[PDB]
């Protein structure tokens, strides 16, 4: 008898056919475009889109005025318009199934630091986030997989304690600015 | 100990049953009280619940009731004549519920002489409750209540012998008492037939 919780789940599904060249080709293209580190970072986004599509694929076989459909479809489409991968007009449940896997990779903080002009390449954006430079409305974020919903997409700035922000430049320059 | 559990026996289909627990204290049974006739000796047994169970082992007195006239007085217990379960409970004089005993019946004849005026079961000091000076007004009550005062033959023929046949209606192994009723009516004819045939 302990005061604990053992509740955990895995968040990726390893593919069945391991060496199919088309699967290796498309996921390596996603790794090289979006600045992911390994294929588990692709499979995790495939798992969250698969869970979303399984929820919509479960709701779509109901009569359209059953109240579970009318409540949970509105909640699921509201979360997808809130994170920004489904646009504001087309909130219908048939438009969940037209989500491509590149929607959730565009809303990561690494891709939204590269697309908002705060880095010179996407790999510079991930190494800028991981070195505690990027903050989102006065919370310093060290997670490159932070999915920026669009009431936080507006506030993306450099840190107040960073050399490319406010001041106090790092140990390389201040050892370098001691010459004598 | 002696256990009265359900699980030491076969099923309704007749197969054996392997036990899944040992004997517990809510399944106990205790050895019997062979209450004999003698001077009064009662132990009390401390039981589950904290209460007392009064274990009579010898008795010579009980509270018996003549039910036809609602007169219940306490009598001696003389002898047992019959038991519907076992003949060894007759020859060893063991008092259990629904045996047939012999009682002393002197306060019943004393109450019959006192409530009514007529004699039963046949000394001028006991004539001084039988025959004495009364007014005419109290004798109007006494001559009223002599109309239903004839008592049936099957009890009155034993009031000549001074022993009424009577049956125990309490349980003398749990409560320590021997209270009961006297046999009358149809039941007296039945049990006189059965003592007549059991010898």
């Amino acid at each position: 008898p302990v005061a604990r919780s053992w509740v955990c789940r895995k968040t990726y599904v390893t593919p069945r056919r391991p060496f199919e060249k088309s699967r290796l080709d498309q996921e390596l293209k996603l790794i090289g475009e979006y600045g992911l580190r390994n294929k588990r970072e692709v499979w995790r986004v495939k798992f969250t889109l698969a869970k979303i599509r399984k929820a919509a694929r479960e709701l779509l076989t109901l009569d359209e005025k059953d109240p579970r459909r009318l409540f949970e479809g509105n909640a699921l489409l509201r979360r997808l318009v809130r994170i920004g991968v489904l646009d504001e007009g087309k909130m219908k449940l048939d438009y969940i199934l037209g989500l491509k896997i590149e929607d959730f990779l565009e809303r990561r903080l690494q891709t939204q630091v590269f697309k908002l002009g705060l880095a010179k390449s996407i790999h510079h954006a991930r190494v800028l986030i991981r070195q505690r430079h990027i903050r989102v409305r006065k919370q310093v974020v060290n997670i490159p997989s932070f999915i920026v919903r669009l009431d936080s997409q507006k506030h993306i700035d450099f840190s107040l304690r960073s050399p490319y922000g406010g001041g106090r430049p790092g140990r390389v320059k201040r050892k370098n600015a001691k010459k004598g | 100990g002696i256990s009265r559990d359900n699980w030491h026996k076969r099923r309704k289909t007749g197969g054996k049953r392997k036990p899944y627990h040992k004997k517990r204290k809510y399944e106990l049974g205790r050895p019997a009280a062979n209450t004999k006739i003698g001077p009064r000796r009662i132990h009390t047994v401390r039981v589950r619940g904290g209460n007392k169970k009064y274990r009579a082992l010898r008795l010579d007195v009980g509270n018996f009731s003549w039910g036809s006239e609602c007169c219940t007085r306490k009598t001696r217990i003389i002898d047992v004549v019959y038991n519907a379960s076992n003949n060894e409970l007759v020859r060893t004089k063991t008092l259990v519920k629904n045996c047939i005993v012999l009682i002393d019946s002197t306060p019943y004849r004393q109450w019959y002489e006192s409530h009514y005026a007529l004699p039963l079961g046949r000394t001028p000091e006991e004539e001084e409750i039988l025959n004495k000076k009364r007014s005419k007004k109290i004798q109007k009550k006494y001559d009223e209540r002599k109309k239903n005062a004839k008592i049936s033959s099957l009890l009155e023929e034993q009031f000549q012998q001074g022993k009424l046949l009577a049956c125990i209606a309490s349980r003398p192994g749990q409560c320590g008492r021997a209270d009961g009723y006297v046999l009358e009516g149809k039941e007296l004819e039945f049990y006189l037939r059965k003592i007549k045939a059991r010898k």
């Binding site: 008898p1 005061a3 919780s5 109240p67 009318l70 409540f71 | -």
Partner: protein
């Protein structure tokens, strides 16, 4: 188990106490008392988690041994004393009074009553019998035994007692047309006016209610607590007034 139990784990506690999972292994077992184990609030829950007058579990004891808290106008030193369904929990150092009333989600609310209102409570009369040279008795649902009742009172009625004395002021008879509250099962907390009772020999009787909105339910007869006469409630009610809104209208009200 060779005897009674004395402990109660946290995940086996009632859901309506709204406990955490990680504060500890055990939950407070309610003491034996007037109210049942699944249907009560102890004082340590009511002072520590609902009102936040005391943060840790020793401070609820430091509250209660200073003779501060009255349950039904009596000073209660047990921190796990069960209270529920119009126990009037009265604290006189701050002058507040609380009546334990189910809100419509089914949970015991912090619902405040007037200092003029805390001299009475209601009681559902569960057993009527006679005794001991014809003395009639009356047994309420919080096990108050009252001698010499009004002789029209029958089972499943509601009486109103004075909390100083313990004596019956007036009573409500069980009918259609009285306002009702459920102390019950899946329909716990809904308030409506009674429309029916279907009488079955040998089993639980089902009583159909119609709400202030007009949606209807029915529960078993042992779950029906009459609040008032007519459609007039005799107590202060929670702020939703017992109308169960659905998850759609509750989201729209939170919007």
């Amino acid at each position: 188990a060779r005897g009674p139990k004395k402990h109660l784990k946290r995940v086996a506690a009632p859901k309506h106490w709204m406990l955490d999972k990680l504060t500890g292994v055990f939950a407070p077992r309610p003491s034996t008392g007037p109210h049942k184990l699944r249907e009560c609030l102890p004082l340590i829950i009511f002072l520590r988690n609902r009102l936040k007058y005391a943060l840790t579990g020793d401070e609820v004891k430091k509250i209660c041994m200073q003779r501060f808290i009255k349950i039904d106008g009596k000073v209660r030193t047990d921190i796990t004393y069960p209270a529920g369904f119009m126990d009037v929990i009265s604290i006189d150092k701050t002058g507040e009074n609380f009546r334990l009333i189910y809100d419509t989600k089914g949970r015991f609310a912090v619902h405040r009553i007037t200092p003029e209102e805390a001299k009475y409570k209601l009681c559902k009369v569960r057993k009527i019998f006679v005794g001991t040279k014809g003395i009639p008795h009356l047994v309420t649902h919080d096990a108050r035994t009252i001698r010499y009742p009004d002789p029209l009172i029958k089972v499943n009625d509601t009486i109103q007692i004075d909390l100083e004395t313990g004596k019956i002021t007036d009573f409500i008879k069980f009918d259609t047309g009285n306002l009702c509250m459920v102390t019950g099962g899946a329909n716990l907390g809904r308030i409506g006016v009674i429309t029916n009772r279907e009488r079955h020999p040998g089993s639980f009787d089902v009583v159909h209610v119609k709400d202030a909105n007009g949606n209807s339910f029915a529960t078993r007869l042992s779950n029906i607590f009459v609040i008032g006469k007519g459609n007039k409630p005799w107590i202060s009610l929670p702020r939703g007034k017992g109308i169960r809104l659905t998850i759609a209208e509750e989201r729209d009200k939170r919007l």
